[PDB]
Design a protein around this nucleic acid. Structure first.
Lengths: 98, 206, 442
RNA sequence: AGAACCUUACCUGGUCUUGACAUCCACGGAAGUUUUCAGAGAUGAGAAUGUGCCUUCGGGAACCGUGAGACAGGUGCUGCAUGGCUGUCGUCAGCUCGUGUUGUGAAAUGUUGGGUUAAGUCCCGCAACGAGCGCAACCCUUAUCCUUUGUUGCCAGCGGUCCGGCCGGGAACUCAAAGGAGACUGCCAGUGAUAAACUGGAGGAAGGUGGGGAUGACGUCAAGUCAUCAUGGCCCUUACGACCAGGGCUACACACGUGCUACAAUGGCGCAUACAAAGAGAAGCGACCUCGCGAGAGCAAGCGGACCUCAUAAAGUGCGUCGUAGUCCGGAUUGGAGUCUGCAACUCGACUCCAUGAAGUCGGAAUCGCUAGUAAUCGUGGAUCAGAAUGCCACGGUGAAUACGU
């Protein structure tokens, strides 16, 4: 019913961020689906290192978007007032779809 | 030049990111440009404040900037006056309301970037580079570093031909990723050209 | 200006004290001048010190009042703010804590009604206030029992209960007490809450038998307390045990819970089984209803009850190590607490062994406090105690309290001390009797 | 990591001089919107309306316009003045220091010697004793299992089937991403200085740095970059600075480098049909339906995306034909008709259709890559990108030969 989509660049950052949401939601209304691991979009990037020549040597960096899903299936609108007071860390995106 | 940047390779292991925020491809670029556009002003205006490291967070249309300095009484100033003067100007640059947290840097000669900026000064103050690198290397050993390697290059003391010099004491396991290496660069603009500075400082194995 | 001999006058204009003045050497913090003159710089000729308190009451038409930090305070029951006053922009008072609610009546009426009445965080002798806190308290225990937060209606409906029945005169806490004095002569019961806190949910069918307030164990009776806050240190059905009654408490049959969590318990127990074992009982809640449809509490222990009936329905045996209790949520684990006569908590935990392993000294001192007779002696050589008590039983108010006295060897003589479990009584009887014998033997 | 203009630094021509881009001062108007004439282009001229802020009644903020001087500007020179970064020997296994000893000394010893290893890797000996930069490990991915959770992901056991996981449902499984376990010569036998270690075996998904990657020491080449940036010195400052239009970077008696496509029957063409992984998408991906032979066009869902879209994988298999004919091989070149992007497709795009069918029949001296999921071959996606790849980067499918040996 209520879908919380959580996206971040770090897996060590998003686990407590999805733990804070799923514990506070289960504390005051319960019945939350498990925090879903979802496939990571990996943006792998090819950059030339030298200013002028030698194409054959390059660097390899990547962006790992760690994405998680948390689902609430039942009406539990006592939580929806205090759930806005969580003010989580800056590295995690949250999107709500009803 | 074939050595890799030690701070870049150590990003996922032991060295934290210099900025942690999320953005999609729409606002990723303007996040970066505004992340730059805050950064020269803090280094230029607080050049006398001995700033070491600047971290940016973007928590949901706000900005948190963490300034690491060894002399917090200069940036804060007399009777708590200049941080609020620094408060609106970054918001003027970024366009969002922001809050700046001052992080004190105790143990100052154990930070590479402040070591790099302090070793920058005396070269354009025209004292000898041999005594300068010597002074910056024993105090880290005296106050308990576990390894330090510094480097200078390019027209030393008026030499017509560029020479590179490096002093190393202790242990610098640059090939060990789990070892904690502190490394950053600085430049000194003398009358003869550009003095380059590279300094690596090692403290712990994990 | 601070540590600077220029003087920030009215507006952004700056001047100074004239060098011919008597007080030119000591410029005060607040100085006023008679004539302003333009020269090489600006100056003031006739200068004199004033107190900054004097200017404000004479400049009522000139003060620009400013209010910042609007925060509500419990200490006065109203909104507080720091005020700032300016004449042509001059900070007469840099900061002053002022009552923001007394200044404007509009926004603080909604603030005061929500805080001091709906939340009810007041310290007052009002008759409606004592009953309304109880009325909100008698539905929260229902939600602490039913474990669903849908029964209680929102606080905005409680906010509209106060606001639509209060007069418009009340904008603060001080206006309310004046209002409550007139109004309560007519309708004390108007502000008291009705019983419309439950409407439709279907979870309002909370049965007192499936959520009892007391637990029975032999001749004992254990008080039950309820809380619904998962992940907490003290969540779950909590038992309140008297400290002198502890020696009559036994752990068998304690894990059956109340019937309100029995369906949910055995699901987690089947979930605690490993995946090859778990696949046999598919699905786990369906097997629970057939299990609960045939068993009754205390006929078998909890571990044995599940093993026999699952083999009854399926035919594959389950060992005692296939059930994992760490994977069971801690709210299903009964919180164990020991009480005094005033319900002061001394130790708490989630098993009876979390109590008895630390309370043995204080249980002994509980026994000795009641035992005001000379049964316990020291320095004894020959049996002079008559018919020694096999078990020492006392009474403390409603409940009995049991013990077991025994002898104690002291390497010079025999003593007598109390013990709280028959086995070490026999051990202390054995060492005491043998030592008493060889002293009695010449 | 992508030249029609732009990019663009080049050329011709038309233009500007505190300037296209900054800061300071003084003055006027808020800004801005719309219209017409001339010019290839930057000017000149109107009409509408500006005018929100801040009460200390004033001014200030944003912006535009004008003038002056301090000043800006340069893809101008010097990579042999430099920083930063890069290639290289070379992932080669080597490179040094403190103290001590020897030698007047430059220097040596450590680092050599016996084995051993991918390795100054390790054991023993040893006037060396230790240490540091390197090796390895710690990092990422892949090869197996277990714990958690289960959407949009899965369908084993159930039921209804609209035969479609479609639905109710079930969490088993695949998988997803977090946590762990595992591989360490750990065990056994032989050899070996009672050592390091080597050889074979058990067990195991994997056995001897398991496979791949990232990681590159002291330094060499006065190596490459002043044109990414920063930068010392010199040079122009009414021009080596600046704006615009058009052309040029795409020319062509030639030669070289690297690729793509073929010379064919293990093949070509047509029909039918099966099996992937990985990635991208909001000034975007763009379903379905309709129109056209087709490039595409109209219409217009869903999708910030395990859902929707790009998006039918192809070599493969089964049928029919071709039959060694410069051919039903090969597609160059050329003419006509079109589609899309974009102010604009002449120079100077890409694609479609029709017409054409050059050379080429396996290539001289010589020369290159590859030690296994590799070579070879068949396709797919992505960065740049309005439009543009046979190049680059990445992903899968089929899938070898050979290593006697120095």
């Amino acid at each position: 019913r209520i879908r919380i989509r959580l996206k971040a660049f770090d897996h060590r950052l998003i686990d407590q961020a999805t733990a804070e949401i799923v514990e506070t939601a289960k504390r005051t209304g319960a019945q939350v689906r498990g925090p879903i691991p979802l496939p990571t979009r990996k943006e792998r990037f090819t950059v030339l290192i030298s200013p002028h020549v030698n194409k054959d040597a390059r660097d390899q960096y990547e962006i790992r978007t760690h994405l998680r899903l948390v689902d609430i299936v039942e009406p539990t609108e006592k939580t929806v007032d205090a759930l806005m007071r969580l003010d989580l860390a800056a590295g995690v995106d949250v999107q709500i779809s009803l | 030049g074939q050595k890799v940047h030690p701070n870049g390779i150590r990003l996922g292991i032991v060295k934290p990111w210099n900025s942690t925020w999320f953005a999609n491809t729409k606002e990723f670029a303007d996040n970066l440009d505004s992340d730059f556009k805050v950064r020269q002003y803090l280094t230029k205006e607080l050049a006398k404040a001995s700033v070491s490291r600047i971290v940016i967070e973007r928590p949901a249309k706000s900005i948190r900037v963490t300034i690491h300095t060894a002399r917090p009484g200069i940036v804060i100033g007399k009777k708590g006056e200049d941080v609020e003067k620094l408060r609106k100007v970054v918001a003027d640059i970024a366009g969002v309301p922001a809050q700046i947290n001052i992080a004190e840097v105790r143990k100052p000669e154990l930070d590479a970037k402040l070591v790099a900026d302090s070793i920058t000064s005396q070269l354009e103050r025209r004292v000898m580079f041999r005594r300068a690198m010597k002074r910056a290397v024993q105090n880290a050993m005296r106050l308990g570093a576990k390894g330090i390697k510094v480097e200078v290059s390019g027209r030393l003391g008026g030499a017509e031909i560029a020479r590179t010099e490096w002093y190393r004491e202790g242990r610098v396991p640059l090939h060990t990723l789990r070892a904690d290496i502190d490394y950053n660069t600085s430049e000194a603009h003398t009358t003869y050209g550009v003095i380059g500075v590279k300094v690596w400082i090692f403290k712990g194995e994990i | 200006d601070a540590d600077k001999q220029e003087y920030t006058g009215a507006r952004n204009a700056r001047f100074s004290i004239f060098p011919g003045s008597g007080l030119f050497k000591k410029p005060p913090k607040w100085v006023m001048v008679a004539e302003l003159v333009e020269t090489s710089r600006l100056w003031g000729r006739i200068a004199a010190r004033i107190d900054p308190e004097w200017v404000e009451p004479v400049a009522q038409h000139l003060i620009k009042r400013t209010y910042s930090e609007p925060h509500w305070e419990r200490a006065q029951g109203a909104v507080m703010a720091t005020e700032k006053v300016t004449v042509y922009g001059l900070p007469i008072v840099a900061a002053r804590k002022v009552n923001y609610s007394q200044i404007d009546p509009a926004l603080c009426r909604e603030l005061f009604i929500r805080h001091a009445l709906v939340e009810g965080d007041w310290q007052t002798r009002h008759a409606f206030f004592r009953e309304n806190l109880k009325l909100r308290a008698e539905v929260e225990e229902l939600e602490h029992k039913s474990r669903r937060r849908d029964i209680l209606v929102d606080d905005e409906t409680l906010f509209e209960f106060y606001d639509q029945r209060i007069s418009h005169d009340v904008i603060s806490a001080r206006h309310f007490d004046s209002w409550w004095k007139k109004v309560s002569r007519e309708t004390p019961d108007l502000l008291n809450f009705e019983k419309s806190m439950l409407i439709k949910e279907g979870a309002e069918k909370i049965s007192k038998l499936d959520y009892p307030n007391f637990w029975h164990q032999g001749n004992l009776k254990l008080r039950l307390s309820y809380q619904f806050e998962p992940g907490a240190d003290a969540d779950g059905v909590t038992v309140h045990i008297p400290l002198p009654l502890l020696n009559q408490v036994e752990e068998s049959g304690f894990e059956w819970q109340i019937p309100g969590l029995r369906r949910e318990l055995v699901i987690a127990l089947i979930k605690s089984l490993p995946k090859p074992v778990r696949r046999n009982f598919v699905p786990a809640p369906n097997y629970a209803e057939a299990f609960l449809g045939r068993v009754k509490p205390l006929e078998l222990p909890l571990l044995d009850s599940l093993e026999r009936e699952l083999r009854r329905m399926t035919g594959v045996t389950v060992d005692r190590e296939d059930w994992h209790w760490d994977q069971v949520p801690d709210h299903l684990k009964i919180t164990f607490r020991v009480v005094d006569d005033k319900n002061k908590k001394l130790k708490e935990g989630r098993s009876l062994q979390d109590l008895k392993d630390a309370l043995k000294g204080k249980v002994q001192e509980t026994l000795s406090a009641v035992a005001d007779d000379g049964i316990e002696q020291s320095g004894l050589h020959i049996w002079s105690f008559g018919q020694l008590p096999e078990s020492y039983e006392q009474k403390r108010g409603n409940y009995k309290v049991k013990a077991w006295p025994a002898l104690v060897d002291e390497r010079d003589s025999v003593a007598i001390k109390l013990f709280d479990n028959p086995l070490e009584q026999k051990q202390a009887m054995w060492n005491g009797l043998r030592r008493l014998l060889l002293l009695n033997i010449p």
